[PDB]
Amino acid sequence: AKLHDYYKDEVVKKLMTEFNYNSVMQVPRVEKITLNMGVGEAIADKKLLDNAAADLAAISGQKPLITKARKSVAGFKIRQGYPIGCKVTLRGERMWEFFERLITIAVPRIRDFRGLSAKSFDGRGNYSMGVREQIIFPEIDYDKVDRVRGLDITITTTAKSDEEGRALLAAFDFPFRK
Amino acid sequence: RSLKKGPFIDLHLLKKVEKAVESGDKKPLRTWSRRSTIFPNMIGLTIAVHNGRQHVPVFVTDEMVGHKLGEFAPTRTYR
Amino acid sequence: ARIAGINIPDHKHAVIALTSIYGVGKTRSKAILAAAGIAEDVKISELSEGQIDTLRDEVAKFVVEGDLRREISMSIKRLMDLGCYRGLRHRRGLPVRGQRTKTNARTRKGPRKP
RNA sequence: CCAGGGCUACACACGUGCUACAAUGGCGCAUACAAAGAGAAGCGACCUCGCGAGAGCAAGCGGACCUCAUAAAGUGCGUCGUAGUCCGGAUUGGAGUCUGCAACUCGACUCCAUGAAGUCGGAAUCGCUAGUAAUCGUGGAUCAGAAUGCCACGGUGAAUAC
RNA sequence: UCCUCCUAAAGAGUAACGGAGGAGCACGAAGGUUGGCUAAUCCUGGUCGGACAUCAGGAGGUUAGUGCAAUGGCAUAAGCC
């Protein structure tokens, strides 16, 4: 439904009517967001595939990528590359579904954000999110694994949002109504 | 930690505080009493607290509301 | 089921579950159950959703976990901003109440280091 | 003679004890006794409020009368079902009483919250032969207030000395 | 004994107890073909990831890589699947 939200809102009425801006191909577009896991040199774990395939096969029936190394350079004794991570880059309708389920778990209930979550500061266009707190799980066993959603989820963002950001939409933490 | 029915202020400390707020800004003077209760109304003094052989200055700030004057003066010396 | 935790408090009693939640002990757990109308001898496992919701409201009307933990944290930080005796003993890792450090300060000292 | 501080420090070492590591036990309710004591610059039931340490002109007593003073282990239950746990409380942070002119150095407690280590302890070593060892309460001295120490009293009460 | 560079004078060759290094193998895939792909390094946000493990973005252009020495190669890749 968040894809329908992107198609519907913030675009089609007021800037189309009063003062024209150029292109809906020029306004920023959410491409494939991604999620990665970061396990150690142990090969014997199955928990990584269990959690990633659970988050994928709650709707689908497919498996994540078991990634060894993009760089293929190791400081250990074996330079070839052990399988030490998982990749799921999200895809189209399922991308919008995962983004919507992340919003509908994190946003409407004040559970996670205690203080100012932004502490390490630099400028150039990165939003990785590591919750380290288990937010949702599809099975009836909510939290039995060693991993606590320590995985990173990457959103690429030119973090400026200038016009209506500094007009009305800052970010912060007062749930209000009409 | 003390009684909530009455704070403990020395009379000599009270007359030093009243004379200091009569004068306004003032260089620190040496006070020998460590048994004191401070207040947010009189936060702003630069009064100094004695602990034995050395005398240290104390500049009170906004967050201390009921603390002793002797807490900020370390009586003991460690390496 | 579970409210804001790492491990399942179920298959136990309600006072034990509300002690296993952080920031509420036995007496405040009994106060929570008394203000919620939930009996103590029943189990938090196989409890209905509405009673769990009333328990959630009872926990939320007082100070929650995490918020009281950071409240303790800025209390200790405010003592360190004072730089008083309590802040100095907190920085040195020495007892604050006033007990001895010649012997038997090993809880504040941790394991014994030669 | 004073005002502050130190005798209460803290990378360590040793001695004497207290609390526990649990089911012989932990938490809520009910239940019948003790003996020895002290009390006027005191003991202070009881009225009232508070899930609290506890706040008044409240009677009685200078002591078989009145107070401290509800004895507790135990006995009946309900529950926890061998877990670092409804075991233990160290430490720490909020809100306070009592004392004393004044509890930061540097008193005891209870109201709320967290719950380190601890899974019965190596070499080595200590006490005890009967109302004893163990275990459970109680009082007194110094004391303005502050004992896990000391003195002292009672409850249950062993095993083994060929 | 064999291989690579220089000496060696821009064809080949060319000596010294001249200057430097390697080989006496490996691979039934590390051969053939078809289809596909492109590195080293640097700057940033996140689970012991810390300076370097894995993602995502940008710069860069072969500074990588070649089963093993060195030289000449190699993107139509002979480099990777």
Coordinates of C-alpha atoms (C1' of nucleotides) in Angstrom, one line a residue:
Chain A
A1 CA 0.0 0.0 0.0
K2 CA 3.0 2.2 0.4
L3 CA 3.6 2.0 -3.4
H4 CA 0.1 3.3 -3.8
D5 CA 1.0 6.0 -1.3
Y6 CA 4.0 7.0 -3.4
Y7 CA 1.9 7.0 -6.6
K8 CA -0.9 9.0 -4.9
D9 CA 0.3 11.6 -2.5
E10 CA 2.6 14.7 -2.3
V11 CA 2.7 15.1 -6.2
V12 CA -0.4 15.3 -8.2
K13 CA -2.6 18.2 -7.0
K14 CA -1.0 21.4 -5.9
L15 CA 2.4 21.5 -7.7
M16 CA 0.6 20.3 -10.8
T17 CA -2.0 23.0 -10.5
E18 CA -0.4 26.2 -9.2
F19 CA 3.3 26.3 -9.9
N20 CA 4.7 23.7 -12.2
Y21 CA 7.8 21.6 -11.5
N22 CA 9.3 19.5 -14.2
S23 CA 9.3 15.8 -13.8
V24 CA 8.0 12.9 -11.7
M25 CA 11.0 11.2 -13.2
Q26 CA 13.1 14.0 -11.6
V27 CA 11.5 13.7 -8.1
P28 CA 13.5 11.1 -6.0
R29 CA 12.4 7.5 -6.4
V30 CA 12.9 4.7 -3.8
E31 CA 15.0 2.0 -5.5
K32 CA 15.8 -1.4 -4.1
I33 CA 16.6 -1.1 -0.4
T34 CA 18.7 -3.8 1.1
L35 CA 19.4 -5.9 4.2
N36 CA 22.7 -7.6 5.1
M37 CA 23.9 -9.9 7.9
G38 CA 27.4 -10.0 9.3
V39 CA 28.3 -13.4 10.8
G40 CA 31.7 -14.5 12.0
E41 CA 34.2 -17.0 10.7
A42 CA 32.1 -19.9 11.9
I43 CA 30.5 -21.9 9.0
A44 CA 28.5 -24.2 11.2
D45 CA 25.7 -21.7 11.8
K46 CA 22.3 -22.2 10.3
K47 CA 20.5 -19.5 12.3
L48 CA 21.5 -16.8 9.7
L49 CA 19.7 -18.7 6.9
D50 CA 16.8 -19.5 9.3
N51 CA 16.1 -15.8 10.1
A52 CA 16.6 -14.4 6.6
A53 CA 14.7 -17.3 4.9
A54 CA 11.9 -16.8 7.5
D55 CA 11.6 -13.1 6.7
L56 CA 11.6 -14.0 3.0
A57 CA 9.4 -17.1 3.1
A58 CA 6.7 -15.7 5.4
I59 CA 5.3 -14.7 2.0
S60 CA 7.7 -16.3 -0.5
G61 CA 9.4 -19.7 -0.7
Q62 CA 12.9 -18.6 -1.7
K63 CA 16.3 -18.4 0.1
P64 CA 18.7 -15.5 0.7
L65 CA 22.1 -15.0 -0.8
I66 CA 24.9 -16.6 1.2
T67 CA 27.7 -14.0 0.5
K68 CA 31.3 -14.9 1.0
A69 CA 33.2 -11.7 -0.1
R70 CA 32.7 -9.0 -2.7
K71 CA 36.3 -7.9 -2.1
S72 CA 37.7 -11.5 -2.0
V73 CA 40.6 -10.2 0.1
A74 CA 41.1 -11.8 3.5
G75 CA 43.4 -10.9 6.3
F76 CA 43.0 -14.5 7.6
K77 CA 45.0 -17.5 6.5
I78 CA 42.4 -18.5 3.8
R79 CA 42.3 -15.7 1.2
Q80 CA 39.5 -17.4 -0.9
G81 CA 36.6 -16.2 1.3
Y82 CA 34.5 -18.0 3.7
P83 CA 30.7 -17.6 3.6
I84 CA 30.3 -15.0 6.3
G85 CA 27.1 -13.1 5.5
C86 CA 23.6 -13.0 4.1
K87 CA 22.1 -10.6 1.6
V88 CA 18.5 -9.9 0.8
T89 CA 17.9 -6.9 -1.4
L90 CA 14.2 -6.1 -1.4
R91 CA 12.3 -6.2 -4.7
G92 CA 9.4 -4.2 -6.1
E93 CA 6.1 -5.0 -4.5
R94 CA 7.8 -7.1 -1.8
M95 CA 10.2 -4.1 -1.3
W96 CA 7.2 -1.8 -0.6
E97 CA 5.6 -4.5 1.6
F98 CA 8.8 -4.9 3.7
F99 CA 9.2 -1.1 4.0
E100 CA 5.5 -0.8 5.0
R101 CA 5.8 -3.6 7.6
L102 CA 8.9 -1.9 9.0
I103 CA 7.0 1.4 9.3
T104 CA 3.9 -0.3 10.8
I105 CA 6.1 -2.0 13.4
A106 CA 8.5 0.9 14.3
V107 CA 6.5 4.1 13.8
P108 CA 3.1 4.0 15.4
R109 CA 4.2 2.5 18.8
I110 CA 6.9 4.3 20.8
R111 CA 9.2 1.5 21.7
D112 CA 12.6 1.8 20.3
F113 CA 13.9 5.4 20.2
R114 CA 14.9 6.5 23.7
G115 CA 17.2 9.5 22.9
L116 CA 19.0 11.1 20.0
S117 CA 19.8 8.1 17.7
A118 CA 22.1 10.2 15.5
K119 CA 25.6 10.3 17.1
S120 CA 28.2 9.5 14.4
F121 CA 28.2 12.5 12.0
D122 CA 29.3 12.8 8.5
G123 CA 27.6 14.1 5.4
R124 CA 27.5 11.9 2.3
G125 CA 24.2 10.2 1.9
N126 CA 24.0 7.0 4.0
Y127 CA 21.2 5.6 6.1
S128 CA 21.9 2.2 7.6
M129 CA 19.6 1.0 10.4
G130 CA 20.6 -1.5 13.0
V131 CA 18.0 -1.9 15.6
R132 CA 19.7 -4.6 17.8
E133 CA 16.1 -5.2 19.2
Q134 CA 13.8 -7.9 17.8
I135 CA 10.9 -5.9 16.2
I136 CA 8.8 -8.5 14.5
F137 CA 9.1 -12.2 13.7
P138 CA 6.5 -14.2 11.6
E139 CA 6.6 -17.5 13.6
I140 CA 4.8 -18.0 16.9
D141 CA 8.2 -18.2 18.6
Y142 CA 9.0 -14.5 18.8
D143 CA 12.6 -14.6 19.9
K144 CA 14.5 -17.9 20.2
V145 CA 17.6 -17.2 18.0
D146 CA 20.9 -15.7 19.0
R147 CA 20.4 -12.7 16.6
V148 CA 18.3 -9.8 17.9
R149 CA 17.8 -8.0 14.5
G150 CA 21.4 -6.8 14.7
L151 CA 21.3 -6.9 10.9
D152 CA 21.7 -3.6 9.0
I153 CA 19.1 -2.3 6.6
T154 CA 20.4 0.2 4.0
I155 CA 18.3 3.1 2.7
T156 CA 20.1 5.6 0.4
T157 CA 19.1 9.1 1.2
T158 CA 20.1 12.6 0.3
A159 CA 19.4 13.7 3.9
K160 CA 18.4 17.3 3.4
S161 CA 14.8 17.4 3.1
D162 CA 14.8 21.1 2.6
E163 CA 11.6 22.6 1.4
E164 CA 8.8 20.9 3.3
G165 CA 11.3 19.4 5.8
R166 CA 12.2 22.8 7.3
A167 CA 8.7 23.9 6.6
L168 CA 6.6 21.4 8.6
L169 CA 8.1 18.0 8.7
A170 CA 11.2 17.7 10.9
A171 CA 11.0 14.2 12.5
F172 CA 10.5 14.4 16.1
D173 CA 8.5 12.4 18.6
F174 CA 5.2 14.0 19.4
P175 CA 2.2 11.8 18.3
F176 CA -0.6 14.2 17.5
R177 CA -4.0 14.1 15.8
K178 CA -6.2 16.3 13.7
Chain B
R1 CA 18.7 12.6 53.5
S2 CA 18.1 15.2 56.2
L3 CA 14.8 16.3 57.7
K4 CA 12.1 17.6 55.3
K5 CA 10.6 19.8 58.0
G6 CA 13.6 22.1 58.3
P7 CA 16.8 22.8 56.3
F8 CA 20.0 23.6 58.2
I9 CA 21.6 27.0 57.4
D10 CA 24.3 28.5 59.6
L11 CA 23.5 32.1 60.8
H12 CA 27.0 33.2 59.9
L13 CA 26.6 31.6 56.5
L14 CA 23.3 33.4 56.1
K15 CA 24.7 36.8 57.0
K16 CA 27.7 36.2 54.5
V17 CA 25.1 35.3 51.8
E18 CA 23.0 38.3 52.6
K19 CA 26.0 40.7 52.5
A20 CA 27.3 39.1 49.3
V21 CA 24.0 39.6 47.5
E22 CA 23.9 43.1 48.9
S23 CA 27.3 43.8 47.4
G24 CA 26.7 41.9 44.1
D25 CA 29.6 40.3 42.3
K26 CA 32.5 39.7 44.7
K27 CA 35.8 37.9 44.9
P28 CA 35.7 34.6 46.9
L29 CA 36.0 34.7 50.7
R30 CA 37.2 31.8 52.8
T31 CA 34.4 30.1 54.7
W32 CA 35.1 27.4 57.3
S33 CA 31.7 25.7 57.5
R34 CA 31.0 22.5 55.5
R35 CA 27.6 21.9 57.1
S36 CA 25.3 23.8 54.8
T37 CA 22.1 23.5 52.7
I38 CA 21.9 25.5 49.5
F39 CA 18.9 26.7 47.5
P40 CA 18.0 27.5 43.9
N41 CA 17.1 31.0 45.1
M42 CA 20.7 31.6 46.2
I43 CA 22.4 29.7 43.5
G44 CA 25.2 31.9 42.2
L45 CA 27.7 32.3 45.0
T46 CA 31.4 31.9 44.6
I47 CA 32.0 31.0 48.2
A48 CA 34.9 28.7 49.0
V49 CA 34.9 25.7 51.4
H50 CA 37.8 24.8 53.7
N51 CA 39.1 21.2 53.9
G52 CA 42.1 21.1 56.2
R53 CA 45.5 22.2 54.9
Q54 CA 44.3 23.4 51.5
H55 CA 41.5 25.8 50.6
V56 CA 39.6 25.2 47.4
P57 CA 37.1 27.5 45.6
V58 CA 33.5 26.4 44.9
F59 CA 31.4 27.8 42.1
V60 CA 27.8 26.6 42.6
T61 CA 25.7 26.0 39.5
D62 CA 22.0 25.5 38.7
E63 CA 21.6 21.7 39.2
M64 CA 22.6 21.5 42.9
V65 CA 19.4 22.0 45.0
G66 CA 20.0 20.4 48.4
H67 CA 23.7 19.4 48.6
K68 CA 26.2 20.2 51.3
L69 CA 29.0 22.7 50.7
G70 CA 31.5 20.0 51.9
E71 CA 30.7 17.6 49.1
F72 CA 32.6 19.6 46.6
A73 CA 35.7 20.0 48.8
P74 CA 37.7 16.8 49.0
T75 CA 39.0 16.3 52.5
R76 CA 41.3 13.4 51.7
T77 CA 44.3 13.2 49.4
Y78 CA 45.0 10.1 47.2
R79 CA 47.7 9.4 44.6
Chain C
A1 CA 2.7 -13.1 26.1
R2 CA 5.6 -10.7 26.3
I3 CA 5.9 -7.0 26.9
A4 CA 9.3 -5.4 26.0
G5 CA 11.8 -8.2 26.8
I6 CA 14.4 -10.7 25.8
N7 CA 12.9 -13.9 27.3
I8 CA 9.4 -15.3 27.8
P9 CA 8.1 -14.9 31.3
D10 CA 5.3 -17.4 30.7
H11 CA 4.6 -20.8 32.4
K12 CA 5.0 -18.9 35.7
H13 CA 3.0 -16.7 38.0
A14 CA 2.1 -13.1 37.3
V15 CA 4.1 -11.6 40.2
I16 CA 7.1 -13.6 38.9
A17 CA 6.6 -12.3 35.4
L18 CA 6.2 -8.7 36.6
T19 CA 9.4 -9.1 38.6
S20 CA 11.2 -10.5 35.5
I21 CA 10.2 -7.3 33.7
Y22 CA 12.8 -4.6 34.5
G23 CA 11.9 -1.7 36.8
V24 CA 9.1 -3.4 38.7
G25 CA 9.7 -5.5 41.8
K26 CA 7.4 -7.7 43.9
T27 CA 5.5 -5.1 45.9
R28 CA 4.9 -2.8 42.9
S29 CA 3.9 -5.9 40.9
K30 CA 1.3 -6.7 43.5
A31 CA 0.2 -3.1 43.3
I32 CA -0.1 -3.4 39.5
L33 CA -2.2 -6.6 39.7
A34 CA -4.4 -5.0 42.5
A35 CA -5.0 -1.9 40.3
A36 CA -5.7 -4.1 37.3
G37 CA -7.9 -6.6 39.1
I38 CA -5.9 -9.6 38.0
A39 CA -5.4 -12.3 40.6
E40 CA -1.9 -13.3 41.6
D41 CA -2.2 -17.1 41.6
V42 CA -3.2 -17.2 37.9
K43 CA -0.5 -17.7 35.3
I44 CA 0.5 -15.1 32.7
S45 CA 0.6 -18.0 30.2
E46 CA -2.9 -18.6 28.8
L47 CA -4.1 -15.1 29.8
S48 CA -6.6 -13.3 27.7
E49 CA -5.6 -10.3 25.5
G50 CA -7.8 -7.8 27.3
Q51 CA -6.3 -8.6 30.7
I52 CA -2.8 -8.3 29.1
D53 CA -3.9 -4.9 27.7
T54 CA -5.0 -3.7 31.1
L55 CA -1.6 -4.9 32.5
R56 CA 0.1 -2.9 29.7
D57 CA -1.9 0.2 30.7
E58 CA -0.9 -0.4 34.4
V59 CA 2.8 -0.6 33.4
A60 CA 2.5 2.4 31.2
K61 CA 0.8 4.6 33.8
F62 CA 3.9 4.4 35.9
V63 CA 7.5 4.8 34.8
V64 CA 8.5 2.2 32.1
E65 CA 11.7 0.3 31.8
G66 CA 14.5 2.0 29.9
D67 CA 13.1 5.5 30.8
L68 CA 13.8 4.8 34.5
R69 CA 17.2 3.3 33.5
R70 CA 18.2 6.4 31.6
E71 CA 16.8 8.5 34.5
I72 CA 19.3 6.6 36.8
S73 CA 21.9 7.3 34.2
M74 CA 21.4 11.1 34.1
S75 CA 21.2 11.1 37.9
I76 CA 24.7 9.6 38.0
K77 CA 25.7 11.9 35.2
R78 CA 24.4 14.9 37.1
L79 CA 26.4 13.8 40.2
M80 CA 29.5 13.7 37.9
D81 CA 28.6 17.2 36.6
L82 CA 28.6 18.2 40.3
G83 CA 32.0 16.6 40.8
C84 CA 31.0 16.1 44.5
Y85 CA 32.0 13.2 46.7
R86 CA 29.3 10.8 45.2
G87 CA 30.6 11.7 41.7
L88 CA 34.2 11.1 42.7
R89 CA 33.4 7.7 44.2
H90 CA 31.5 6.8 41.1
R91 CA 34.4 7.7 38.9
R92 CA 37.0 5.9 41.1
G93 CA 34.7 2.9 41.4
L94 CA 34.7 3.1 45.2
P95 CA 31.7 2.8 47.5
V96 CA 29.4 5.9 47.8
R97 CA 27.3 5.3 50.9
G98 CA 30.4 5.5 53.2
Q99 CA 31.4 1.9 54.0
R100 CA 35.0 0.8 54.4
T101 CA 37.6 0.2 51.6
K102 CA 40.4 -1.3 53.7
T103 CA 38.7 -4.7 53.3
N104 CA 35.3 -5.8 51.8
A105 CA 34.9 -3.3 49.0
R106 CA 35.0 -6.1 46.5
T107 CA 31.5 -5.4 45.0
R108 CA 32.6 -1.9 43.9
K109 CA 36.1 -3.1 43.1
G110 CA 35.1 -6.2 41.1
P111 CA 37.4 -9.1 40.9
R112 CA 40.6 -8.9 42.9
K113 CA 43.6 -7.5 40.9
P114 CA 47.1 -7.9 42.2
Chain D
rC1 C1' 41.5 27.2 74.1
rC2 C1' 39.3 26.9 69.4
rA3 C1' 37.1 26.1 63.9
rG4 C1' 37.6 22.3 60.2
rG5 C1' 39.7 17.4 59.0
rG6 C1' 41.8 12.4 60.4
rC7 C1' 41.3 8.2 63.8
rU8 C1' 36.2 5.4 58.9
rA9 C1' 42.0 6.1 53.4
rC10 C1' 43.1 1.5 49.6
rA11 C1' 46.9 -1.6 43.9
rC12 C1' 47.2 -5.6 48.6
rA13 C1' 48.1 -9.6 53.0
rC14 C1' 46.2 -12.1 57.6
rG15 C1' 42.9 -13.1 62.0
rU16 C1' 37.6 -13.3 64.4
rG17 C1' 32.6 -13.3 63.0
rC18 C1' 27.7 -12.4 60.1
rU19 C1' 24.7 -13.6 55.7
rA20 C1' 23.8 -17.3 52.2
rC21 C1' 24.8 -20.9 48.2
rA22 C1' 18.7 -23.7 49.1
rA23 C1' 13.1 -27.9 49.1
rU24 C1' 15.6 -29.9 55.8
rG25 C1' 14.0 -24.3 52.1
rG26 C1' 11.6 -19.2 50.1
rC27 C1' 6.6 -16.0 50.0
rG28 C1' 1.1 -14.8 52.0
rC29 C1' -2.6 -16.4 56.2
rA30 C1' -3.8 -18.8 61.1
rU31 C1' -1.7 -20.7 65.7
rA32 C1' 0.1 -22.0 72.1
rC33 C1' 3.6 -21.0 75.9
rA34 C1' 9.2 -19.2 77.7
rA35 C1' 13.3 -17.7 80.9
rA36 C1' 16.5 -13.6 82.1
rG37 C1' 16.3 -8.5 82.4
rA38 C1' 16.0 -2.9 82.2
rG39 C1' 13.0 1.6 82.7
rA40 C1' 12.3 9.2 85.6
rA41 C1' 17.7 14.6 81.5
rG42 C1' 13.3 7.4 81.2
rC43 C1' 10.2 2.9 79.8
rG44 C1' 6.3 4.8 77.3
rA45 C1' 0.4 0.4 75.9
rC46 C1' -3.4 2.8 73.9
rC47 C1' -6.4 7.5 70.6
rU48 C1' -5.7 9.2 65.5
rC49 C1' -3.2 8.7 59.7
rG50 C1' -0.3 6.0 56.6
rC51 C1' 0.7 -1.0 52.1
rG52 C1' 6.4 3.0 56.1
rA53 C1' 10.6 4.2 59.1
rG54 C1' 7.0 6.6 62.2
rA55 C1' 4.4 12.8 64.0
rG56 C1' 0.7 15.9 70.4
rC57 C1' -1.2 18.1 76.5
rA58 C1' -2.4 9.5 76.1
rA59 C1' -3.0 6.3 81.0
rG60 C1' 0.5 3.2 84.2
rC61 C1' 5.4 2.7 86.7
rG62 C1' 10.1 4.9 89.8
rG63 C1' 8.8 -1.4 89.8
rA64 C1' 5.5 -10.0 90.9
rC65 C1' 0.8 -4.4 89.1
rC66 C1' 2.5 -0.5 83.8
rU67 C1' 5.8 -0.6 79.4
rC68 C1' 9.7 -2.7 76.4
rA69 C1' 7.1 -7.6 74.7
rU70 C1' 3.8 -9.6 68.6
rA71 C1' 8.8 -14.8 71.0
rA72 C1' 11.0 -17.5 66.9
rA73 C1' 12.4 -21.9 65.0
rG74 C1' 8.0 -25.3 65.1
rU75 C1' 2.8 -26.8 63.8
rG76 C1' -1.5 -26.6 59.6
rC77 C1' -2.3 -24.9 54.7
rG78 C1' -2.0 -22.5 49.4
rU79 C1' 2.3 -21.9 46.1
rC80 C1' 7.3 -22.1 44.1
rG81 C1' 9.3 -28.0 41.5
rU82 C1' 15.7 -28.3 41.7
rA83 C1' 16.6 -23.3 37.7
rG84 C1' 21.9 -18.5 39.6
rU85 C1' 16.1 -19.8 40.4
rC86 C1' 9.4 -16.6 44.7
rC87 C1' 17.3 -18.8 47.4
rG88 C1' 20.7 -15.0 49.1
rG89 C1' 21.2 -10.1 49.8
rA90 C1' 26.1 -7.0 48.2
rU91 C1' 26.2 -2.5 45.4
rU92 C1' 23.8 1.7 43.2
rG93 C1' 19.7 5.5 42.3
rG94 C1' 15.1 8.1 43.8
rA95 C1' 11.2 9.7 48.3
rG96 C1' 11.9 9.9 54.2
rU97 C1' 11.6 9.0 59.8
rC98 C1' 14.3 9.0 64.8
rU99 C1' 18.5 11.1 67.5
rG100 C1' 21.6 15.2 68.2
rC101 C1' 23.1 22.7 67.4
rA102 C1' 24.4 20.0 62.8
rA103 C1' 24.4 12.3 59.2
rC104 C1' 29.3 14.9 52.6
rU105 C1' 33.8 12.8 54.8
rC106 C1' 31.1 9.8 59.0
rG107 C1' 24.7 6.4 62.4
rA108 C1' 20.5 2.8 62.2
rC109 C1' 16.2 1.9 59.6
rU110 C1' 12.0 1.4 56.6
rC111 C1' 8.8 3.4 51.3
rC112 C1' 10.2 2.3 45.7
rA113 C1' 13.6 0.3 41.9
rU114 C1' 18.4 -3.1 40.2
rG115 C1' 19.8 -7.7 41.9
rA116 C1' 27.6 -8.8 41.3
rA117 C1' 29.8 -12.9 43.3
rG118 C1' 27.7 -17.3 45.4
rU119 C1' 26.4 -24.4 42.4
rC120 C1' 28.8 -26.2 50.0
rG121 C1' 35.0 -24.1 49.1
rG122 C1' 42.6 -26.5 47.6
rA123 C1' 46.9 -27.2 50.7
rA124 C1' 45.9 -26.6 55.5
rU125 C1' 43.1 -25.9 60.1
rC126 C1' 39.3 -25.0 64.6
rG127 C1' 35.4 -26.1 68.6
rC128 C1' 32.6 -29.8 71.1
rU129 C1' 31.4 -35.9 75.4
rA130 C1' 24.6 -33.9 77.3
rG131 C1' 21.0 -30.3 78.0
rU132 C1' 26.8 -30.6 74.9
rA133 C1' 27.5 -29.5 69.7
rA134 C1' 24.3 -27.4 66.1
rU135 C1' 20.0 -24.3 65.4
rC136 C1' 16.1 -20.4 66.8
rG137 C1' 14.6 -16.2 69.3
rU138 C1' 15.2 -12.5 73.7
rG139 C1' 17.4 -9.0 77.2
rG140 C1' 21.5 -5.9 79.3
rA141 C1' 26.3 -2.8 79.5
rU142 C1' 28.5 1.4 77.4
rC143 C1' 24.6 4.7 74.6
rA144 C1' 22.0 11.9 72.8
rG145 C1' 21.6 8.2 68.2
rA146 C1' 24.3 4.0 66.2
rA147 C1' 26.5 -3.9 67.7
rU148 C1' 26.9 -9.1 62.6
rG149 C1' 31.1 -7.8 68.8
rC150 C1' 30.7 -8.7 74.3
rC151 C1' 28.0 -10.2 78.5
rA152 C1' 23.5 -13.0 79.7
rC153 C1' 18.8 -16.0 79.3
rG154 C1' 15.5 -19.5 77.6
rG155 C1' 13.0 -23.2 72.9
rU156 C1' 14.0 -27.6 69.9
rG157 C1' 17.9 -30.6 70.8
rA158 C1' 21.8 -34.8 68.4
rA159 C1' 25.7 -38.5 66.6
rU160 C1' 30.0 -41.1 68.6
rA161 C1' 33.9 -42.5 72.4
rC162 C1' 36.0 -50.2 70.5
Chain E
rU1 C1' 71.2 -29.6 -16.3
rC2 C1' 66.8 -26.3 -17.4
rC3 C1' 63.8 -21.2 -17.2
rU4 C1' 63.5 -15.3 -16.6
rC5 C1' 65.9 -10.1 -16.6
rC6 C1' 70.3 -7.1 -17.2
rU7 C1' 75.3 -7.2 -19.0
rA8 C1' 74.3 -7.4 -24.8
rA9 C1' 76.4 -2.4 -28.4
rA10 C1' 67.5 -0.7 -30.9
rG11 C1' 67.8 -8.0 -36.0
rA12 C1' 69.7 -13.2 -34.0
rG13 C1' 73.8 -14.4 -31.1
rU14 C1' 77.5 -13.1 -27.4
rA15 C1' 81.9 -14.2 -21.9
rA16 C1' 83.5 -13.9 -16.6
rC17 C1' 84.2 -17.6 -9.5
rG18 C1' 79.5 -10.7 -13.4
rG19 C1' 74.7 -8.5 -11.1
rA20 C1' 69.6 -10.7 -9.4
rG21 C1' 66.0 -14.6 -8.9
rG22 C1' 63.5 -19.6 -9.8
rA23 C1' 62.7 -25.1 -11.8
rG24 C1' 63.3 -31.1 -11.1
rC25 C1' 56.1 -29.6 -10.5
rA26 C1' 50.6 -29.0 -10.5
rC27 C1' 45.6 -29.7 -12.9
rG28 C1' 40.4 -35.0 -15.1
rA29 C1' 39.9 -29.6 -13.8
rA30 C1' 43.2 -25.3 -13.0
rG31 C1' 41.7 -28.8 -20.3
rG32 C1' 37.7 -27.8 -24.5
rU33 C1' 33.4 -25.0 -25.8
rU34 C1' 29.1 -21.9 -25.0
rG35 C1' 26.8 -18.1 -22.1
rG36 C1' 27.8 -14.3 -18.6
rC37 C1' 30.9 -10.8 -15.7
rU38 C1' 35.0 -7.2 -14.5
rA39 C1' 39.5 -5.4 -10.7
rA40 C1' 43.6 -2.9 -6.7
rU41 C1' 42.9 1.2 -3.7
rC42 C1' 40.5 5.6 -1.2
rC43 C1' 36.1 8.3 1.4
rU44 C1' 31.4 7.5 4.3
rG45 C1' 26.6 5.3 7.7
rG46 C1' 25.8 -0.1 10.8
rU47 C1' 25.9 -7.1 15.1
rC48 C1' 31.9 -8.7 19.1
rG49 C1' 33.3 -5.2 11.8
rG50 C1' 38.1 -3.1 15.4
rA51 C1' 42.4 0.5 10.9
rC52 C1' 41.2 -4.2 7.4
rA53 C1' 35.3 -9.6 7.8
rU54 C1' 29.7 -8.3 5.3
rC55 C1' 26.2 -4.6 2.8
rA56 C1' 24.9 0.3 0.1
rG57 C1' 26.7 4.7 -2.5
rG58 C1' 30.6 7.7 -4.7
rA59 C1' 35.8 8.4 -6.7
rG60 C1' 39.4 5.6 -9.6
rG61 C1' 40.5 2.7 -14.3
rU62 C1' 43.8 -2.4 -14.2
rU63 C1' 47.8 1.1 -9.8
rA64 C1' 44.4 -5.8 -9.7
rG65 C1' 44.7 -10.9 -11.2
rU66 C1' 47.3 -15.0 -13.7
rG67 C1' 48.6 -22.4 -9.7
rC68 C1' 54.2 -21.2 -8.9
rA69 C1' 60.4 -17.0 -10.3
rA70 C1' 61.0 -13.0 -13.7
rU71 C1' 60.1 -10.8 -18.5
rG72 C1' 56.9 -9.8 -22.4
rG73 C1' 51.5 -10.0 -22.5
rC74 C1' 46.3 -10.0 -21.7
rA75 C1' 39.2 -6.0 -21.9
rU76 C1' 37.6 -9.5 -28.3
rA77 C1' 40.2 -10.5 -21.9
rA78 C1' 44.6 -15.5 -21.9
rG79 C1' 41.6 -12.5 -15.3
rC80 C1' 36.3 -14.4 -12.5
rC81 C1' 31.6 -17.7 -12.5

